[PDB]
Design an enzyme around this catalytic site. Structure first.
Site, mmCIF file in Angstrom:
data_model
loop_
_atom_site.group_PDB
_atom_site.id
_atom_site.type_symbol
_atom_site.label_atom_id
_atom_site.label_comp_id
_atom_site.label_asym_id
_atom_site.label_seq_id
_atom_site.Cartn_x
_atom_site.Cartn_y
_atom_site.Cartn_z
ATOM 1 N N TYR A 183 1.005 -1.415 0.082
ATOM 2 C CA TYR A 183 0.125 -0.052 -0.048
ATOM 3 C C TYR A 183 1.054 1.311 -0.041
ATOM 4 O O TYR A 183 2.190 1.302 0.349
ATOM 5 C CB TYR A 183 -0.987 0.053 1.026
ATOM 6 N N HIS A 228 7.365 2.763 16.711
ATOM 7 C CA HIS A 228 6.908 1.633 15.645
ATOM 8 C C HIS A 228 7.664 0.551 15.494
ATOM 9 O O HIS A 228 6.995 -0.642 15.375
ATOM 10 C CB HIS A 228 6.132 2.566 14.542
#
EC number: 1.3.98.5
Lengths: 217, 214, 219, 215, 218
Positions: free
Chosen positions: C121, C144
């Protein structure tokens, strides 16, 4: 000086209806002949660009400019009558007009560059209402941040009321990754807080029309 | 009093016109002539090609009733030219009294046009009257330098997806560009939600227009 | 500091393939073999069908120059399979130096071992993301990574795409178990960087397949 | 109180021409009217057919039909698509609503013009204190009292499609719908709106004249 | 414990043949062959009329995504499949809930038939999963409490992160269509409505056996 000359500039993007025929003899020659006749009327084709693969719905871009919009409209329709033009679907075609800056590389510098990135631009609603000093500082600082990329030739042309946008931008460079790096670096400019729209991007390789036609599906 | 509906109808070529397009323009000109007998006015036909990839032709027509313009629209779609075209955008508006029109008072031809719809912010019509009056007056003041650009702003609430349709007519295209850029400095720009699509082009008689399209 | 362009090209069937599709896959494999001889790498072909109504096939290919990938793309579109397909989404990117680490090899060049599934994506950050104090961006990117530590079986690729198309980054995740990609993405919804996101669709997700089995299975 | 207890589904179906109707279109309208007559015998009401052409580039025809069940309207829709007129049309937008606690049940008198659009409120609209919602819905009622000639319908459509309400305004003078909508831009409830397009506006016509006038 | 679920939505290219004998039989036989391979067709639904751009939805589920991809392509080769255009096809699977210990999705626990369905995707606000756990637990608990008046509406919530453009796919099954409408309207009063980014398209329609579904389509 060069701000008193009127020059409209048009970027016209097309995609293949399907593919070109296996026998495409004469396709490029016909387009080159049209471009040559347009040159006699001071309609300039600055380049033709192969966009294929970098976008699913675009294959070819033509960058042309002239003294009047009408000349470019005629050029556009004449191209659409060529065999190549009849094998293409129009995708995006946007005109801009050189206006004096508040505080143009394609008219001063014609040396070829290998790659191009073209995109339209719309500022935030507040941008043109900001205090003059805010806009002056921000436009100045984006110049300072760009100084490390003298190899990327930048064009920013007004397009208010000619279409859906406020500016059309075109960046020309011999190394494609230098356009990527410039654009990434300018994400650190405060003017990024005053942006509403900047797509579609049309990026590709400048090619002579013969090689361009030969390479398309 | 004087009710006048005004319609801007935009079309794109399905592909190109035939090489032999004899009679295409004549048929349309005959239709426009018969519409004139019915007081349906074709203010202009405009060549949009090149300035937009998905539009080639615009018709600006107006009449006393919406029904007359619907009839005109369908009659045009039956012409050979209309059958070579795909509808793109067709929006009607109606002259209404201003809170605080040049296309009816002035018929002299202009070379270029810019047409776009308009939607204000949700709170624009809720602002104190003096706030709207001030910003609308100030945008008038800022437009004073462009008397050669003929402006129309026509209400379209409930006729379509928008609140107003705007049309700007000028003999020099760069003056429309410069006017639009200059009005980016009006405080009313803080109260805008939508203003596209823009359809800009060259007014042409239908014979020359048909001859010039791909 | 070695330049490698990478391209994800997504196609959908115009209709279906013919009942007799002999030689469709063979023609494409021959093209892939010729491209490989010229150091154009086809990392995988993926079956996207059913997981998206408007996509059936994805090709992940990479090369030293954008031009080589443009040529490959057009040559694929000339194959019988290519002529049965409509282009849907094709986006190029390349690894660039990270802001806060000294790694110069993207994961896909460092590890080519096969994985069953992929999710691809594009990505666009908030307008303010690159204007934040360096330490805030450093901290959120570090976090993250920390949150992804429980998913070492998901191979992540992050490649820059500024000015090559409509996006800033293209992301690709490769895993042998499809639900582990789902679980990773759900878990990272708890990262503060989620407050600095503008766009992350379309998602193209599917099963890596050899071109023979891929062609056989498409409608 | 026989009003908000009777169940009635209502459907607005919008179509555009594929290209043009044939020059010989005899029987097209009659076939559709025959279907409408058979549907009325089954208590499927065709409230109107409307010419949308010209006012929108991608719409030519609207049918407003209503029935006791959604299934009856689905059948009606598909039967229409089998007529010769239906086969010359492409569906554009078809949205159902359900009368939940409208003048399309109290008033059958024809009106010349219609405007139909869907509606979605702000995310927090239904979370506002009840007094705020009562005040705004009341004030917006007050603002509409100068337009008793505009017949208004607001019908719930939660979970039947992408919207929360479908609205329909019917009037004999088209400019009165324009003026009402402009006037209601001064209502406080305008601060609590997320979506209100597409607008489909047109002229009510008997099917014979409608078919004759389409390209 | 792993079960992928897929909702595939199609629209007519134009209409079906006037004489469409054999269209439904071919599809039902495919459904029977798929059931032998533990690919379940939970339902086929008539969406026509309630949406201009959709006519048919298939809800199918299986142990692997790959089995559903094969089923999808096999359906597209049927005569009915070849008269249809794909519109929207989205896969999901049940994952552990944040705040409950249920491990079986409702659709595997209860397969009794229901007349009507509403299916839509869902995307939460960017800050939703960043809220303090207690705030999210409270708002999810409140939406359950507000749904207690609608025990006749069968709800499924399945995760779809990274399988498509969404976070969740939601499905609601009920014998009375107005009860789905009323449930959704009622839950507009839940505080979680302040934490929503996307929830369309809605695909709502009537469950039918494939024979009657095919017979009724234009």
């Amino acid at each position: 000086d060069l701000n008193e000359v009127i020059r409209y500039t048009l970027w016209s993007v097309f995609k293949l209806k399907d593919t070109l025929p296996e026998d495409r003899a004469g396709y490029a020659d016909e387009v080159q002949e049209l471009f040559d006749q347009l040159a006699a009327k001071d309609v300039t084709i600055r380049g033709t660009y192969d966009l294929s693969g970098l976008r699913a719905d675009a294959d070819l871009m033509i960058w042309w400019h002239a003294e009047t919009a009408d000349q470019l409209q005629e050029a556009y329709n004449l191209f659409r009558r060529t065999k190549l033009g009849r094998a293409l679907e129009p995708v995006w075609s946007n005109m801009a007009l050189h206006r004096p800056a508040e505080f143009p590389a394609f008219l001063a510098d014609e040396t070829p560059r290998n790659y191009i990135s073209v995109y339209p631009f719309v500022r935030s609603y507040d941008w043109y209402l900001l205090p003059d000093e805010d806009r002056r500082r921000m436009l100045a600082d984006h110049l300072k941040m760009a100084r490390g990329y003298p190899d990327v030739r930048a064009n920013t042309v007004a397009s208010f009321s000619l279409g859906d946008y406020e500016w059309i931008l075109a960046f020309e460079a011999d190394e494609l990754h230098r356009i990527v790096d410039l654009m990434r670096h300018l994400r650190g400019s405060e003017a990024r807080r005053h942006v509403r729209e900047e797509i579609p991007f049309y990026t590709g390789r400048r090619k002579d029309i013969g090689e361009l036609v030969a390479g398309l599906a």
